[PDB]
Amino acid sequence: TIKVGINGFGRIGRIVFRAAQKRSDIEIVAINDLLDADYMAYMLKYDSTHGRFDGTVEVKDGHLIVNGKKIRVTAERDPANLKWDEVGVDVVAEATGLFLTDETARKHITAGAKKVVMTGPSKDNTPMFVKGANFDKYAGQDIVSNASCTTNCLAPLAKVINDNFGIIEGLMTTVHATTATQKTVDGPSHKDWRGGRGASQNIIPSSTGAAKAVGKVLPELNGKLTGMAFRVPTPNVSVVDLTVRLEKAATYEQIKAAVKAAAEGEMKGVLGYTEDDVVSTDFNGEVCTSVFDAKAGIALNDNFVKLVSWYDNETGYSNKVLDLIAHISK
Amino acid sequence: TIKVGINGFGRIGRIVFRAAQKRSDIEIVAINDLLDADYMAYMLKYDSTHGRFDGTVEVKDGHLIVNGKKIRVTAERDPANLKWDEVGVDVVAEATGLFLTDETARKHITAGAKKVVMTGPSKDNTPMFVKGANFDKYAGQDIVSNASCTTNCLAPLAKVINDNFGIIEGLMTTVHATTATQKTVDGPSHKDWRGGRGASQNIIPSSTGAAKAVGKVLPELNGKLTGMAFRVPTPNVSVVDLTVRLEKAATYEQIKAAVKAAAEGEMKGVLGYTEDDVVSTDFNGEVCTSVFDAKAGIALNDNFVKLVSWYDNETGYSNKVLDLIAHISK
Ligand SMILES: NC(=O)c1ccc[n+]([C@@H]2O[C@H](COP(=O)([O-])OP(=O)(O)OC[C@H]3O[C@@H](n4cnc5c(N)ncnc54)[C@H](O)[C@@H]3O)[C@@H](O)[C@H]2O)c1
Ligand SMILES: NC(=O)c1ccc[n+]([C@@H]2O[C@H](COP(=O)([O-])OP(=O)(O)OC[C@H]3O[C@@H](n4cnc5c(N)ncnc54)[C@H](O)[C@@H]3O)[C@@H](O)[C@H]2O)c1
């Protein structure tokens, strides 16, 4: 199997670990953060969002013992000091959010790993890969990114709408749930003033280049999309609101048939389709990175439409990151 | 196999149905509320608090088919028009919060049912039974009550404490989750001015009879306890705060030992014991009606202490309701 090492036992680092348990190809051998193996264990055991860990976790000699398997624990602030090779790591999952450039994330390879997958969009030219978008373009690069959560939701959809009706232009808006970067009450966020204001108290307009990034994963769409976001008071799962102009006219019943078909075939396991009266909680724990909501979307006419799709920014993305690791190996 | 009908397909009505699916002695044969079989099916398929129904459900002829079995659907507002006997209903789970007196609840007997179990404390002399307190005092009555979610938490604990060191007097406080009786924004609640205030915006002081009621199911304690509640912005899982004076002096480590023993034996399944740094969400879906939080409790001296216990006001209570049903059914 593929020996995976995690750096940053955060929301993504933890959920990636949880979901990694229901996989036969990958296996977590080591974890790094800045905590004691007893706190790390408490963090894995209880989750306010996805409930109690489904298995056993014990602390022993400063390391974890999850499901009877020893997980090496470290608390090194610098990635270059991780000696991942002492534990046989193949690919490293960069979930800290501090190492999204090649020079930063490469410390993992010089530390003994083989490849690295950033759990966020790269900040330099490091290639981004999206399941159902361009996984087929991976060219053996040793450091890759899995784009963002919003992109993993918008790319698979735009792709289907473009392949059937051709997208002239599109403007996206994602209503996102709160994340670890926000504040409980109005506090400092000097890189983004709006993002520091009380999360649970407001609807916070926010920026995102997830729409622009779709043109980089699907070049055909390059430059045709852009958008923004609204951070709202929910602990998880968000939804994208894409308004596009189409080349080849089509009725909603027709747009519906297109998505459902992809959802049933090529985009199976990535793009989903539903006609139910769902709400955000119905997706807490969802593995499909994009679930089309037939009943929520709306069209002004056969060439101007607003489509809506759901994504559990935590589980969907975390599962795809693992897919990318399996993809780039061997 | 006990056949049961549910009156009021609400939060408790619905969780009871879900809990019953894992039991082989109980069988839900009919359901009544004030809605269509298709809305009923939606209410059951999707739950914001406990996830998507874990099984199959379909609508047919105007009734539902859940897990290969057919459930009769009615929308009768007057319980006496239910003809429970047409489907062979043994016991009915009164879950509307509207028929909590023998008079109103007896209509279910008039309608064909042989026994009734109100999911709320009786409004009259109707006998209340609480698992871990007075189940063994059931004397064949046809109409009983499972008390409240709060009394089902306090009674089991108050008994281990009484039996071990004797309780002279106690005052209780329950930090309770929001319920269907509350409102989204400041609205009319003619019978509880505070309860009508925006649930999500306030810490709402509320009165309880759960404390006194403990003396009714544990006569020894009669008159020695009383209390109040605080309604806070959470969707589920509450906790009781018991401050008591003890006859026999006991260290906190003595008290814990007693609880842990009753929990690991005599009260196993009703009262639980933990020493972890738990929070409310860690109990969403908990079956034990009272989980003692060792680490949260505080003692002023060997005769004056504050004890803490957690309870999923939805899942534990709904499970014990099925317990009482199984109990009175012999
Ligand atoms: N939150 C989401 O829903 C979501 C979805 C997709 C992608 N992402 C991306 O994934 C990354 C993970 O975000 P997250 O939500 O888990 O955040 P998080 O803050 O919950 O987790 C990050 C973890 O990094 C640890 N850490 C900090 N400095 C470290 C260091 N020097 N060495 C090792 N560990 C260190 C922190 O203690 C923390 O546990 C971010 O870059 C984010 O942009 C987040
Ligand atoms: N909410 C809790 O956590 C909790 C815990 C223990 C006990 N209880 C008790 O259980 C009862 C259930 O409360 P709940 O939270 O499920 O409330 P709820 O409002 O969610 O459920 C009540 C259901 O009754 C239906 N109903 C109304 N009038 C009816 C009629 N004439 N005939 C049939 N159905 C009718 C409503 O449409 C609704 O679905 C209450 O009496 C409450 O005191 C509630």
PDB file of C-alpha atoms in Angstrom, chain A residues 61-309:
ATOM      1  CA  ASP A  61       5.206   5.948  24.309  1.00  0.00           C
ATOM      2  CA  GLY A  62       4.375   9.320  22.802  1.00  0.00           C
ATOM      3  CA  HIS A  63       2.793   7.762  19.723  1.00  0.00           C
ATOM      4  CA  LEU A  64      -0.744   6.897  18.743  1.00  0.00           C
ATOM      5  CA  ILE A  65      -2.130   3.404  18.372  1.00  0.00           C
ATOM      6  CA  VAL A  66      -5.174   3.664  16.108  1.00  0.00           C
ATOM      7  CA  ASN A  67      -7.102   0.488  15.417  1.00  0.00           C
ATOM      8  CA  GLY A  68      -4.121  -1.310  16.936  1.00  0.00           C
ATOM      9  CA  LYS A  69      -1.632   0.271  14.552  1.00  0.00           C
ATOM     10  CA  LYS A  70       1.148   2.555  15.764  1.00  0.00           C
ATOM     11  CA  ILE A  71       1.185   6.035  14.241  1.00  0.00           C
ATOM     12  CA  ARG A  72       4.419   7.950  14.724  1.00  0.00           C
ATOM     13  CA  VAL A  73       3.810  11.405  16.203  1.00  0.00           C
ATOM     14  CA  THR A  74       6.092  14.472  15.961  1.00  0.00           C
ATOM     15  CA  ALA A  75       5.737  18.182  16.692  1.00  0.00           C
ATOM     16  CA  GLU A  76       8.347  19.793  14.412  1.00  0.00           C
ATOM     17  CA  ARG A  77       7.565  23.307  13.182  1.00  0.00           C
ATOM     18  CA  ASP A  78       9.960  22.936  10.227  1.00  0.00           C
ATOM     19  CA  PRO A  79       9.063  20.288   7.578  1.00  0.00           C
ATOM     20  CA  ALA A  80      12.699  19.677   6.634  1.00  0.00           C
ATOM     21  CA  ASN A  81      13.202  18.072  10.079  1.00  0.00           C
ATOM     22  CA  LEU A  82      10.512  15.372   9.673  1.00  0.00           C
ATOM     23  CA  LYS A  83      12.667  12.435   8.532  1.00  0.00           C
ATOM     24  CA  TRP A  84       9.567  10.891   6.895  1.00  0.00           C
ATOM     25  CA  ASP A  85      11.701   8.125   5.378  1.00  0.00           C
ATOM     26  CA  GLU A  86      12.358   6.607   8.789  1.00  0.00           C
ATOM     27  CA  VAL A  87       8.704   5.648   8.746  1.00  0.00           C
ATOM     28  CA  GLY A  88       8.589   4.802   5.033  1.00  0.00           C
ATOM     29  CA  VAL A  89       6.435   7.680   3.767  1.00  0.00           C
ATOM     30  CA  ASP A  90       5.564   7.674   0.030  1.00  0.00           C
ATOM     31  CA  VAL A  91       3.420  10.792  -0.293  1.00  0.00           C
ATOM     32  CA  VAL A  92       2.949  13.655   2.190  1.00  0.00           C
ATOM     33  CA  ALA A  93      -0.364  15.449   2.668  1.00  0.00           C
ATOM     34  CA  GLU A  94       0.343  19.150   3.301  1.00  0.00           C
ATOM     35  CA  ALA A  95      -2.638  20.262   5.374  1.00  0.00           C
ATOM     36  CA  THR A  96      -1.069  23.080   7.400  1.00  0.00           C
ATOM     37  CA  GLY A  97      -1.862  25.788   4.872  1.00  0.00           C
ATOM     38  CA  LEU A  98       1.582  27.317   5.337  1.00  0.00           C
ATOM     39  CA  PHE A  99       3.441  25.447   2.644  1.00  0.00           C
ATOM     40  CA  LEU A 100       1.714  26.020  -0.700  1.00  0.00           C
ATOM     41  CA  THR A 101       4.769  26.880  -2.829  1.00  0.00           C
ATOM     42  CA  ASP A 102       7.338  24.502  -4.273  1.00  0.00           C
ATOM     43  CA  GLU A 103      10.243  25.704  -2.089  1.00  0.00           C
ATOM     44  CA  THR A 104       8.147  25.301   1.058  1.00  0.00           C
ATOM     45  CA  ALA A 105       6.416  22.004   0.257  1.00  0.00           C
ATOM     46  CA  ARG A 106       9.659  20.468  -1.100  1.00  0.00           C
ATOM     47  CA  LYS A 107      11.183  20.368   2.398  1.00  0.00           C
ATOM     48  CA  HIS A 108       9.004  17.245   2.680  1.00  0.00           C
ATOM     49  CA  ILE A 109      10.854  15.506  -0.120  1.00  0.00           C
ATOM     50  CA  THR A 110      14.265  16.612   1.117  1.00  0.00           C
ATOM     51  CA  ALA A 111      13.044  15.208   4.444  1.00  0.00           C
ATOM     52  CA  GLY A 112      12.752  11.809   2.787  1.00  0.00           C
ATOM     53  CA  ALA A 113       9.299  11.626   1.207  1.00  0.00           C
ATOM     54  CA  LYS A 114       8.763  10.965  -2.505  1.00  0.00           C
ATOM     55  CA  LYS A 115       5.883  13.212  -3.480  1.00  0.00           C
ATOM     56  CA  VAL A 116       3.624  15.797  -1.877  1.00  0.00           C
ATOM     57  CA  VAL A 117      -0.018  16.846  -2.325  1.00  0.00           C
ATOM     58  CA  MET A 118      -1.022  20.283  -1.056  1.00  0.00           C
ATOM     59  CA  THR A 119      -4.547  20.319   0.427  1.00  0.00           C
ATOM     60  CA  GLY A 120      -5.063  23.822  -0.876  1.00  0.00           C
ATOM     61  CA  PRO A 121      -4.388  25.733  -4.103  1.00  0.00           C
ATOM     62  CA  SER A 122      -0.677  26.294  -4.816  1.00  0.00           C
ATOM     63  CA  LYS A 123       0.673  29.844  -4.547  1.00  0.00           C
ATOM     64  CA  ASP A 124       3.189  29.433  -7.366  1.00  0.00           C
ATOM     65  CA  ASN A 125       3.193  27.394 -10.588  1.00  0.00           C
ATOM     66  CA  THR A 126       2.784  23.993  -8.880  1.00  0.00           C
ATOM     67  CA  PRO A 127       0.098  22.151 -10.929  1.00  0.00           C
ATOM     68  CA  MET A 128      -3.419  21.722  -9.563  1.00  0.00           C
ATOM     69  CA  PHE A 129      -5.420  18.539 -10.256  1.00  0.00           C
ATOM     70  CA  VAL A 130      -9.152  17.943  -9.941  1.00  0.00           C
ATOM     71  CA  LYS A 131     -10.963  14.609 -10.046  1.00  0.00           C
ATOM     72  CA  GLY A 132     -13.257  14.624 -13.071  1.00  0.00           C
ATOM     73  CA  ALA A 133     -11.378  17.581 -14.529  1.00  0.00           C
ATOM     74  CA  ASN A 134      -7.729  16.910 -15.333  1.00  0.00           C
ATOM     75  CA  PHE A 135      -6.506  13.971 -13.274  1.00  0.00           C
ATOM     76  CA  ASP A 136      -5.721  12.566 -16.711  1.00  0.00           C
ATOM     77  CA  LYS A 137      -3.087  15.270 -17.218  1.00  0.00           C
ATOM     78  CA  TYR A 138      -0.850  14.317 -14.307  1.00  0.00           C
ATOM     79  CA  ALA A 139       2.640  14.015 -15.747  1.00  0.00           C
ATOM     80  CA  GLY A 140       4.577  12.465 -12.881  1.00  0.00           C
ATOM     81  CA  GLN A 141       5.354  15.772 -11.126  1.00  0.00           C
ATOM     82  CA  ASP A 142       6.597  15.154  -7.539  1.00  0.00           C
ATOM     83  CA  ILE A 143       4.719  18.082  -5.946  1.00  0.00           C
ATOM     84  CA  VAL A 144       1.059  18.722  -6.779  1.00  0.00           C
ATOM     85  CA  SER A 145      -1.983  20.505  -5.385  1.00  0.00           C
ATOM     86  CA  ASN A 146      -5.631  19.365  -5.186  1.00  0.00           C
ATOM     87  CA  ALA A 147      -6.917  22.898  -5.791  1.00  0.00           C
ATOM     88  CA  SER A 148      -9.525  24.279  -3.396  1.00  0.00           C
ATOM     89  CA  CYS A 149     -12.823  22.875  -2.100  1.00  0.00           C
ATOM     90  CA  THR A 150     -14.907  25.365  -4.112  1.00  0.00           C
ATOM     91  CA  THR A 151     -13.025  24.474  -7.298  1.00  0.00           C
ATOM     92  CA  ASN A 152     -13.591  20.755  -6.786  1.00  0.00           C
ATOM     93  CA  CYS A 153     -17.292  21.596  -6.767  1.00  0.00           C
ATOM     94  CA  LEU A 154     -17.376  24.129  -9.649  1.00  0.00           C
ATOM     95  CA  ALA A 155     -15.025  22.378 -12.079  1.00  0.00           C
ATOM     96  CA  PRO A 156     -16.942  19.095 -12.523  1.00  0.00           C
ATOM     97  CA  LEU A 157     -20.155  21.029 -13.146  1.00  0.00           C
ATOM     98  CA  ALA A 158     -18.844  23.735 -15.488  1.00  0.00           C
ATOM     99  CA  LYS A 159     -17.206  20.941 -17.453  1.00  0.00           C
ATOM    100  CA  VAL A 160     -20.551  19.191 -18.090  1.00  0.00           C
ATOM    101  CA  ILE A 161     -22.359  22.422 -18.921  1.00  0.00           C
ATOM    102  CA  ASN A 162     -19.545  23.427 -21.256  1.00  0.00           C
ATOM    103  CA  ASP A 163     -19.331  20.046 -23.003  1.00  0.00           C
ATOM    104  CA  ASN A 164     -23.053  20.161 -23.846  1.00  0.00           C
ATOM    105  CA  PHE A 165     -24.039  23.786 -24.299  1.00  0.00           C
ATOM    106  CA  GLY A 166     -20.773  25.710 -24.298  1.00  0.00           C
ATOM    107  CA  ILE A 167     -20.342  28.352 -21.586  1.00  0.00           C
ATOM    108  CA  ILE A 168     -20.003  31.866 -23.006  1.00  0.00           C
ATOM    109  CA  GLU A 169     -19.292  33.453 -19.622  1.00  0.00           C
ATOM    110  CA  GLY A 170     -20.020  32.636 -15.996  1.00  0.00           C
ATOM    111  CA  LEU A 171     -20.151  34.430 -12.632  1.00  0.00           C
ATOM    112  CA  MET A 172     -19.985  32.246  -9.485  1.00  0.00           C
ATOM    113  CA  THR A 173     -20.985  32.872  -5.854  1.00  0.00           C
ATOM    114  CA  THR A 174     -20.420  30.256  -3.137  1.00  0.00           C
ATOM    115  CA  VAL A 175     -22.228  30.477   0.219  1.00  0.00           C
ATOM    116  CA  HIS A 176     -19.508  28.939   2.399  1.00  0.00           C
ATOM    117  CA  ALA A 177     -19.605  27.582   5.946  1.00  0.00           C
ATOM    118  CA  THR A 178     -17.271  28.871   8.652  1.00  0.00           C
ATOM    119  CA  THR A 179     -13.699  27.524   8.728  1.00  0.00           C
ATOM    120  CA  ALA A 180     -10.721  27.572  11.086  1.00  0.00           C
ATOM    121  CA  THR A 181      -9.608  30.966   9.726  1.00  0.00           C
ATOM    122  CA  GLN A 182     -12.497  32.955  11.145  1.00  0.00           C
ATOM    123  CA  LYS A 183     -13.004  34.478  14.598  1.00  0.00           C
ATOM    124  CA  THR A 184     -15.554  33.696  17.342  1.00  0.00           C
ATOM    125  CA  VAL A 185     -15.965  37.437  18.019  1.00  0.00           C
ATOM    126  CA  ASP A 186     -14.688  40.572  16.221  1.00  0.00           C
ATOM    127  CA  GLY A 187     -10.920  40.140  16.311  1.00  0.00           C
ATOM    128  CA  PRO A 188      -7.706  40.728  14.266  1.00  0.00           C
ATOM    129  CA  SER A 189      -7.422  39.452  10.666  1.00  0.00           C
ATOM    130  CA  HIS A 190      -5.074  42.003   9.099  1.00  0.00           C
ATOM    131  CA  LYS A 191      -4.908  40.150   5.750  1.00  0.00           C
ATOM    132  CA  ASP A 192      -8.718  40.252   5.499  1.00  0.00           C
ATOM    133  CA  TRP A 193     -10.693  42.620   7.725  1.00  0.00           C
ATOM    134  CA  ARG A 194     -14.088  41.131   6.911  1.00  0.00           C
ATOM    135  CA  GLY A 195     -12.855  37.662   7.830  1.00  0.00           C
ATOM    136  CA  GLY A 196     -12.068  38.646  11.407  1.00  0.00           C
ATOM    137  CA  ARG A 197     -15.564  39.811  12.301  1.00  0.00           C
ATOM    138  CA  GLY A 198     -17.731  37.497  14.411  1.00  0.00           C
ATOM    139  CA  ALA A 199     -18.372  34.430  12.274  1.00  0.00           C
ATOM    140  CA  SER A 200     -21.591  33.253  13.920  1.00  0.00           C
ATOM    141  CA  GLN A 201     -22.990  36.807  13.971  1.00  0.00           C
ATOM    142  CA  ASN A 202     -22.660  37.714  10.266  1.00  0.00           C
ATOM    143  CA  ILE A 203     -22.909  36.961   6.576  1.00  0.00           C
ATOM    144  CA  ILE A 204     -19.314  37.859   5.604  1.00  0.00           C
ATOM    145  CA  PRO A 205     -18.518  38.690   1.968  1.00  0.00           C
ATOM    146  CA  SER A 206     -15.240  36.991   1.069  1.00  0.00           C
ATOM    147  CA  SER A 207     -12.860  36.572  -1.882  1.00  0.00           C
ATOM    148  CA  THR A 208     -12.067  33.453  -3.863  1.00  0.00           C
ATOM    149  CA  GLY A 209     -10.145  32.648  -7.026  1.00  0.00           C
ATOM    150  CA  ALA A 210     -11.888  29.304  -7.296  1.00  0.00           C
ATOM    151  CA  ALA A 211     -13.818  30.444 -10.366  1.00  0.00           C
ATOM    152  CA  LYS A 212     -10.625  31.693 -12.067  1.00  0.00           C
ATOM    153  CA  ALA A 213      -8.908  28.424 -11.126  1.00  0.00           C
ATOM    154  CA  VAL A 214     -11.457  26.461 -13.160  1.00  0.00           C
ATOM    155  CA  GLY A 215      -9.900  27.918 -16.314  1.00  0.00           C
ATOM    156  CA  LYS A 216      -6.535  26.535 -15.190  1.00  0.00           C
ATOM    157  CA  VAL A 217      -7.801  22.989 -14.608  1.00  0.00           C
ATOM    158  CA  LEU A 218     -10.154  23.165 -17.648  1.00  0.00           C
ATOM    159  CA  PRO A 219      -8.210  25.442 -20.062  1.00  0.00           C
ATOM    160  CA  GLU A 220     -11.108  25.515 -22.509  1.00  0.00           C
ATOM    161  CA  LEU A 221     -12.849  27.619 -19.847  1.00  0.00           C
ATOM    162  CA  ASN A 222      -9.802  29.837 -19.221  1.00  0.00           C
ATOM    163  CA  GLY A 223     -10.849  33.396 -18.499  1.00  0.00           C
ATOM    164  CA  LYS A 224     -14.582  32.730 -18.879  1.00  0.00           C
ATOM    165  CA  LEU A 225     -15.401  32.512 -15.142  1.00  0.00           C
ATOM    166  CA  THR A 226     -14.861  34.519 -11.943  1.00  0.00           C
ATOM    167  CA  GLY A 227     -16.693  34.914  -8.630  1.00  0.00           C
ATOM    168  CA  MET A 228     -16.899  35.684  -4.920  1.00  0.00           C
ATOM    169  CA  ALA A 229     -18.146  34.246  -1.621  1.00  0.00           C
ATOM    170  CA  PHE A 230     -20.267  34.796   1.457  1.00  0.00           C
ATOM    171  CA  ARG A 231     -19.155  33.204   4.731  1.00  0.00           C
ATOM    172  CA  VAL A 232     -22.200  32.197   6.757  1.00  0.00           C
ATOM    173  CA  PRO A 233     -22.857  30.668  10.244  1.00  0.00           C
ATOM    174  CA  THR A 234     -22.839  26.896   9.673  1.00  0.00           C
ATOM    175  CA  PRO A 235     -19.987  24.615  10.753  1.00  0.00           C
ATOM    176  CA  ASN A 236     -19.753  22.706   7.477  1.00  0.00           C
ATOM    177  CA  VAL A 237     -20.893  22.079   3.912  1.00  0.00           C
ATOM    178  CA  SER A 238     -21.232  24.901   1.381  1.00  0.00           C
ATOM    179  CA  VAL A 239     -22.967  25.431  -1.991  1.00  0.00           C
ATOM    180  CA  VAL A 240     -22.009  27.178  -5.283  1.00  0.00           C
ATOM    181  CA  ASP A 241     -24.392  29.475  -7.160  1.00  0.00           C
ATOM    182  CA  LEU A 242     -23.198  29.614 -10.802  1.00  0.00           C
ATOM    183  CA  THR A 243     -24.856  32.014 -13.255  1.00  0.00           C
ATOM    184  CA  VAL A 244     -23.850  31.302 -16.879  1.00  0.00           C
ATOM    185  CA  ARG A 245     -24.705  32.294 -20.462  1.00  0.00           C
ATOM    186  CA  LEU A 246     -24.759  29.368 -22.869  1.00  0.00           C
ATOM    187  CA  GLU A 247     -23.869  29.082 -26.567  1.00  0.00           C
ATOM    188  CA  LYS A 248     -26.285  26.305 -27.563  1.00  0.00           C
ATOM    189  CA  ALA A 249     -29.713  27.094 -26.094  1.00  0.00           C
ATOM    190  CA  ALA A 250     -31.229  24.396 -23.857  1.00  0.00           C
ATOM    191  CA  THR A 251     -34.224  23.966 -21.544  1.00  0.00           C
ATOM    192  CA  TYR A 252     -33.784  23.307 -17.832  1.00  0.00           C
ATOM    193  CA  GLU A 253     -35.242  19.870 -18.390  1.00  0.00           C
ATOM    194  CA  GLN A 254     -32.389  19.546 -20.838  1.00  0.00           C
ATOM    195  CA  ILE A 255     -29.692  20.876 -18.563  1.00  0.00           C
ATOM    196  CA  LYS A 256     -31.014  18.460 -15.931  1.00  0.00           C
ATOM    197  CA  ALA A 257     -30.712  15.496 -18.290  1.00  0.00           C
ATOM    198  CA  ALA A 258     -27.123  16.450 -19.068  1.00  0.00           C
ATOM    199  CA  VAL A 259     -25.954  16.563 -15.433  1.00  0.00           C
ATOM    200  CA  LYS A 260     -27.801  13.425 -14.350  1.00  0.00           C
ATOM    201  CA  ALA A 261     -26.231  11.573 -17.266  1.00  0.00           C
ATOM    202  CA  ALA A 262     -22.677  12.586 -16.378  1.00  0.00           C
ATOM    203  CA  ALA A 263     -23.431  11.930 -12.714  1.00  0.00           C
ATOM    204  CA  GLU A 264     -24.461   8.410 -13.783  1.00  0.00           C
ATOM    205  CA  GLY A 265     -21.477   7.798 -16.027  1.00  0.00           C
ATOM    206  CA  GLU A 266     -18.164   9.574 -16.488  1.00  0.00           C
ATOM    207  CA  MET A 267     -18.591  11.800 -13.455  1.00  0.00           C
ATOM    208  CA  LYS A 268     -19.752   8.980 -11.161  1.00  0.00           C
ATOM    209  CA  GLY A 269     -18.305   9.393  -7.672  1.00  0.00           C
ATOM    210  CA  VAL A 270     -17.439  13.043  -8.310  1.00  0.00           C
ATOM    211  CA  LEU A 271     -20.598  14.713  -9.624  1.00  0.00           C
ATOM    212  CA  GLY A 272     -23.956  13.798  -8.103  1.00  0.00           C
ATOM    213  CA  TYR A 273     -27.563  14.518  -8.999  1.00  0.00           C
ATOM    214  CA  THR A 274     -30.652  15.077  -6.861  1.00  0.00           C
ATOM    215  CA  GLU A 275     -34.251  16.204  -7.250  1.00  0.00           C
ATOM    216  CA  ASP A 276     -35.067  16.242  -3.518  1.00  0.00           C
ATOM    217  CA  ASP A 277     -35.860  19.193  -1.238  1.00  0.00           C
ATOM    218  CA  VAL A 278     -32.427  18.987   0.433  1.00  0.00           C
ATOM    219  CA  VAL A 279     -30.705  21.496   2.782  1.00  0.00           C
ATOM    220  CA  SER A 280     -27.026  21.797   3.809  1.00  0.00           C
ATOM    221  CA  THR A 281     -27.079  19.178   6.616  1.00  0.00           C
ATOM    222  CA  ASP A 282     -28.212  16.518   4.129  1.00  0.00           C
ATOM    223  CA  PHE A 283     -24.665  16.683   2.830  1.00  0.00           C
ATOM    224  CA  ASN A 284     -22.626  16.586   6.035  1.00  0.00           C
ATOM    225  CA  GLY A 285     -20.335  13.651   5.317  1.00  0.00           C
ATOM    226  CA  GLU A 286     -20.976  13.628   1.537  1.00  0.00           C
ATOM    227  CA  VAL A 287     -18.169  12.133  -0.554  1.00  0.00           C
ATOM    228  CA  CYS A 288     -19.253  13.470  -3.981  1.00  0.00           C
ATOM    229  CA  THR A 289     -17.486  16.829  -4.405  1.00  0.00           C
ATOM    230  CA  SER A 290     -20.400  18.284  -6.396  1.00  0.00           C
ATOM    231  CA  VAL A 291     -24.074  17.454  -5.959  1.00  0.00           C
ATOM    232  CA  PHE A 292     -26.374  19.149  -8.451  1.00  0.00           C
ATOM    233  CA  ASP A 293     -29.668  20.365  -6.936  1.00  0.00           C
ATOM    234  CA  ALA A 294     -32.126  20.124  -9.820  1.00  0.00           C
ATOM    235  CA  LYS A 295     -34.958  21.668  -7.845  1.00  0.00           C
ATOM    236  CA  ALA A 296     -33.010  24.725  -6.614  1.00  0.00           C
ATOM    237  CA  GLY A 297     -31.565  25.958  -9.915  1.00  0.00           C
ATOM    238  CA  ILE A 298     -33.380  28.410 -12.182  1.00  0.00           C
ATOM    239  CA  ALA A 299     -33.258  29.824 -15.722  1.00  0.00           C
ATOM    240  CA  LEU A 300     -34.279  33.193 -17.162  1.00  0.00           C
ATOM    241  CA  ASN A 301     -34.411  31.659 -20.667  1.00  0.00           C
ATOM    242  CA  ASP A 302     -32.752  28.914 -22.732  1.00  0.00           C
ATOM    243  CA  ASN A 303     -29.374  30.722 -22.622  1.00  0.00           C
ATOM    244  CA  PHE A 304     -29.277  32.392 -19.196  1.00  0.00           C
ATOM    245  CA  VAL A 305     -29.364  30.072 -16.178  1.00  0.00           C
ATOM    246  CA  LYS A 306     -28.395  29.799 -12.482  1.00  0.00           C
ATOM    247  CA  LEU A 307     -27.252  26.353 -11.326  1.00  0.00           C
ATOM    248  CA  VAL A 308     -26.688  25.220  -7.726  1.00  0.00           C
ATOM    249  CA  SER A 309     -24.506  22.365  -6.451  1.00  0.00           C
TER     250      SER A 309
END
